[PDB]
Amino acid sequence: PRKGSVPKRDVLPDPIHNSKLVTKLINKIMLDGKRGTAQRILYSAFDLVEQRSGRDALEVFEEAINNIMPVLEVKARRVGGSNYQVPVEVRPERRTTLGLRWLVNYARLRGEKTMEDRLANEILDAANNTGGAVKKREDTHKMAEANKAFAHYRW
């Protein structure tokens, strides 16, 4: 807004895994205002995945949100007959908003049945640099490359 800036809202850790990267992933999972049926989907997919792969539940999830952290990205201006897409560098707290919704809306776009395991097959494929969520820090990373020419039009 014009007048200035504001804070955000600072959420207290999970009961169990003891991070705030799993409270801010329920707020991406929650919908319509129902934190009941979002905490089935998020503790039934740390142990629907913890079987499949024999290391911890939180180091195969937290490497599943660090292949997805887009480091560059495009923003726009106009010219007067063209409208060029500039590439800007991404802050250290916006890469954590996008990795966590590039992982949860690339899960309703999947052909499994119950979203215990869509979210479960997407934290284990995305841990190996592959599939849906983690081409999209690659969709979004040529566009900051193709446009490497228009960088001087920056702010």
């Binding site: 190996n128 640099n129 592959t130 599939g131 849906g132 983690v134 081409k135 690659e138």
Partner: protein, 51 residues
Amino acid sequence: SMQEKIIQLIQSFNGAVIIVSHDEIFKDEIRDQVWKIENCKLIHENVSINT
């Protein structure tokens, strides 16, 4: 002369198609989804693990 009359046909079909082909200049402008058989399993083009 007939390789063009059926390249327009495959493009003017408004359904879904699975194409198996070895010529490069036909499967170059129609590349939407590209699976592949490497060892014994099919892969996709959403695997940005290569480069």
